[PDB]
Amino acid sequence: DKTVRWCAVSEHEATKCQSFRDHMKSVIPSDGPSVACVKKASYLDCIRAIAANEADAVTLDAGLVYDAYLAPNNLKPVVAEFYGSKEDPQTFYYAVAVVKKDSGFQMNQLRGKKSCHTGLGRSAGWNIPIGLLYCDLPEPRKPLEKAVANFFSGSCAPCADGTDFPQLCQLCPGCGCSTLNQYFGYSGAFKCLKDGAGDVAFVKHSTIFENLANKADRDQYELLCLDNTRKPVDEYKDCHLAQVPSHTVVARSMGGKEDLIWELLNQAQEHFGKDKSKEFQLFSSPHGKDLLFKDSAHGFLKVPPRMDAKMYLGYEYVTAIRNLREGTCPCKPVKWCALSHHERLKCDEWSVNSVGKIECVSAETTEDCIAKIMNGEADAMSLDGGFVYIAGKCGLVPVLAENYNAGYFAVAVVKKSASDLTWDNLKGKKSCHTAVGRTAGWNIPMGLLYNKINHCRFDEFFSEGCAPGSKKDSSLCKLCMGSGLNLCEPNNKEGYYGYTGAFRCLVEKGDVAFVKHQTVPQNTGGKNPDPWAKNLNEKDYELLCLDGTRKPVEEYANCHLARAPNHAVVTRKDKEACVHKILRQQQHLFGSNGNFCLFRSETKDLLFRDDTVCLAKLHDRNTYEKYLGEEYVKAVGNLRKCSTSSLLEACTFRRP
């Protein structure tokens, strides 16, 4: 059967669900999803029923989304409620810490300040801020109210026990738990700040815009960022305490039925959603308010399938709720993320030589390791500039850059015998790329090509080619040499993948290869002993300049497509300082100094490139926008209209 068993937590919800089930069977045909309704006593009972394969779906708050993720439940977000409008769908809200401009303190200086909270037990006003500040609170940290009462000098914490902790009600005596208290709720907490009662108000990002119409008044307020800096109130997406999803449908991570749940809800909103004017309304009911879904909801959005709960909730939110539930308080070792057996063996050797300073975790793909750095399972890894873009769009920052001597040169190599090829038109020619999304093989060459054809459908511009990472049926996979599953894969099991692989593709099948300036010299003249490269002479290959002219391989300095940003190490902002220090201390111990160490591989370019001489600092360029540059980001923004990165789709869902 294609039945979705929806879980209700009340008798009113079960009645609406039964009405939901009956009306669906009128609009959905024979081969479509049907609804069944399981009634449980609580949200947690619904979570257990779904984990026990007794139900399939339920819509939860963010805190319960975290509960549904923990073992042995292992549920994941599948469908999202959005609000506001269908043209500007609102799925998340941001918990922010608002202060007055020029008040002179940062997030790590809140001790002794006066605080304004929407109310004890609320998300943006209490659970999230106190969660992030948990180990800053004095010991003993339980009961939590007493620890907060000895952190802030005075507060307005509505509904707190002012009898035992009167400091929590200094700004609103009695801590009135109703709108009779002027500083209660979403608006009252900000009024507590606006009226000068407190120094910081923990509210939602939208609270400031609902209480201050003129931007001139909003310019008198700032937000506290977790990096201990301040930003204007309209930059909350780059300066919040946590990004929080409002209402989320969850399901089993394995066993589904995700596709069925979305097909059901998508057809449900098409027939009974907002402004559908039927007898049955998906987002209201005569039996009660907010049954199954919020009455204020406007519809549903499908959660990208790469998304898990920790990625959906976000690193900041998970940190805050973990502290509140576990109560665990300790520069710590840096956890490197390896992508292969030989990369893991190298890191494992690096870790013991570190005597603890470095540790290793492994993942199967580059995107998987990036996700581990995002949620905290891993700490750092080095990436091509194309992945720095993805890592940046997902919230990570670069901390150090690989230096080989301004970065390396992206070149277009062609066979010199074919003296007809020029950069001014390679249409209908066979191309070989390192991989889709990489700097030298894709972002730089195809970025310029986009400016002349105005579309990212490069498989109908070139006749065929090998671009690892393309859809298996693409014409840009026809030239690749991988066998079976490995064909066109962006990894080692595809022989045409990478700098060297793309040059081999040119030598054997292609017409033009997009690689870096040293690729041809180090793979010709016997330097590469493999049969495909052993007898190659580098004077038999040329580069395509932007002029439309061609020059020898060694003349790349005056015949390159563009300068490429160096490979860089990425990490979370909360570990930027510790990674910057430990790595620069380890390269002084194992850098350019069996014979070598860190910058040498048993195979080829493990963890770092082998031509790396140092790990250089970045100064202000600690941001993917400022590291890659405006032109690089603009080009990738043009190319993403044909992107197939599931990790980038998940992060773009949280921050378009």
Which span (110-118, 162-170, 247-255, 278-286) binds Fe ion, by CB under 5 A?
Answer: 110-118
Total number of residues that touch Fe ion (CB under 5 A): 7
Q: Does 118 appear as a known binding residue?
A: yes
What is the sign of the dihedral through the CA atoms of 502, 507, 511 and 517? positive
Note whether 446 and 638 are within 8 A (CB). no
Q: Which of 568, 575, 550 is nearest to 632 (CA)?
A: 568
- What are the backbone dihedrals phi and psi of residue 616, each rounded to the nearest 5 degrees, phi first? -90, 150
Q: Is 207 part of any known ligand binding site?
A: no
**N- to C-terminal Cα separation, the chain:** 37
Binding string, residues 451-480; x marks residues near Fe ion by CB under 5 A: ------------------------------
Q: Which of 51, 79, 97, 124 binds Fe ion (CB under 5 A)?
A: 124
Residue closest to 128 by CA, chosen among 247, 242, 245: 242
Does 323 bind Fe ion (CB under 5 A)? Our answer is no
Q: In 384-401, which positions are buried (b, 16+ CB within 10 angstroms) versus exposed (e)? A: bbbbbbbbbbbbbbbbbb
- Count, in order, helices (H) and strands (E) of the chain: 21, 27
**CB contact set of 72 (below 8 Å; sequence gap of 6+):** 51
Residue 297 CB, nearest approach to Fe ion (Å):
18
Give the span between the Cα atoms of 338 and 214, in whole angstroms. 51
Backbone angles phi, psi at 591, to 5 degrees: -85, -145
Closer residue to Fe ion, CB minimum distance, 118 or 167? 118
The CA distances from residue 653 to 207, 297, 393, 398, 627, in Å, are 23, 18, 11, 22, 23
**Is residue 602 within 8 Å of 345, Cβ to Cβ?**
yes
Contact status: 285 vs Fe ion (CB under 5 A): no
Closest contact distance (angstroms) between CB of 560 and Fe ion is: 14
Nearer to Fe ion, 201 or 399 (CB): 201
- Angle CA 462–468–471, to nearest 5: 75
The answer to whether the annotation marks 205 as part of a ligand binding site is no
Contact status: 122 vs Fe ion (CB under 5 A): yes
Cβ closest to Fe ion, residue 148 vs residue 307: 148
**Is 408 labelled as part of a ligand binding site?**
yes
Print the binding letters for residues 161-200 with Fe ion: x by CB under 5 A, - otherwise.
Answer: -------------------------x--------------
Quickly count: other Cβ atoms within 10 Å of residue 179's Cβ.
11
Say whether 124 counts as a known binding-site residue: yes
From the CB of 612, what's the least distance to Fe ion, in Å?
A: 12
Known binder of ligand: residue 69?
no
Write down the least CB distance from residue 567 to Fe ion, Å: 6
Q: Any contact of residue 605 with Fe ion (CB under 5 A)? A: no
Q: Taking the complex as a whole, how short is the minimal distance between the CB of residue 95 and Fe ion, in angstroms? A: 8
What is the smallest separation between the CB atom of 93 and Fe ion, expressed in angstroms? 9
Contact status, residue 155 vs residue 198, Cβ threshold 8 Å: yes
User: Does the annotation flag 567 for ligand binding?
Assistant: yes
DSSP strands (E only) in 297-347: 299-302, 334-338
The CB-of-270 to Fe ion minimum distance in angstroms stands at: 32
Tell me if 183 is assigned to a ligand binding site: no
**Cα–Cα nearest to 378, from 458, 304, 301, 315:** 315
Q: Is 455 annotated as a binding residue?
A: no
**Rounded-to-integer distance, Cα 100 and Cα 413, Å:** 57
Q: Which is nearer to Fe ion, 382 or 439 (CB)?
A: 439
> Tokens representing 608?
């770092």
**Residue 644: what residue type?**
T
93 carries a ligand binding annotation: yes
Six-digit token pair at 115?
A: 């605080």
- Amino acid symbol at 277: S
Count of Cβ atoms closer than 10 Å to residue 32 Cβ: 14
Choose the stretch contacting Fe ion; rule: CB under 5 A; options: 12-20, 33-41, 439-447, 578-586.
439-447
Shortest distance (Å) from residue 376 CB to Fe ion: 26
SS3 content of the chain, % helix, strand, coil (to 5): 35, 20, 45
Least gap, CB of 420 to Fe ion (angstroms):
29
3-class DSSP state of 175: coil
Q: For residue 237, what are its two tokens?
A: 């997406």
Q: Is 438 annotated as a binding residue?
A: yes
Instruction: Tell the smallest beta-carbon distance from residue 282 to Fe ion (Å).
Output: 25
Question: Is 556 labelled a binding residue?
Answer: no
Residue nearest to Fe ion (CB): 384
Which residues in 344-403 contact Fe ion (CB under 5 A)? Answer: 384
Is 122 annotated in a binding site? The answer is yes
Region from 1-9, 40-48, 130-138, 432-440 binding Fe ion, contact rule CB under 5 A: 432-440
Please identify, using beta-carbon distances, which residue of 59 and 434 lies nearer to Fe ion. 434
Shortest distance, CB of residue 185 to Fe ion, whole angstroms?
7
User: What is the nearest approach in angstroms of Fe ion to the Cβ of residue 125?
Assistant: 5
Query: Phi/psi class of residue 454: alpha, beta or left (left: φ > 0; alpha: ψ in -120 to 50)?
Result: left
Q: Which is closer to Fe ion, CB of 73 or CB of 382?
A: 382
Closest C-alpha among 436, 372, 143, 94 to residue 241: 94
> Taking contact as CB under 5 A, which single stretch among the options 120-128, 360-368, 389-397, 576-584 is the one that binds Fe ion?
120-128
**Residue closer to Fe ion (CB basis): 316 or 384:** 384
Stretch binding Fe ion (CB under 5 A), from 105-113, 115-123, 261-269, 338-346: 115-123
247 is in an annotated binding site: yes
Q: Nearer to Fe ion by C-beta: 33 or 437?
A: 437
Q: Which two tokens stand for residue 110?
A: 């809140």
Q: Does 118 bind Fe ion (CB under 5 A)?
A: yes
Give phi and psi for 36, each to the nearest 5.
-120, 155
Annotated binding residues for Fe(3+), as ranges? 61, 93, 186, 247, 384, 408, 499, 567
Annotated binding residues for hydrogencarbonate, as ranges? 118, 122, 124-125, 434, 438, 440-441
Binding site for Fe ion (CB under 5 A): 118, 122, 124-125, 186, 384, 439
Annotated binding residues, as ranges? 61, 93, 118, 122, 124-125, 186, 247, 384, 408, 434, 438, 440-441, 499, 567
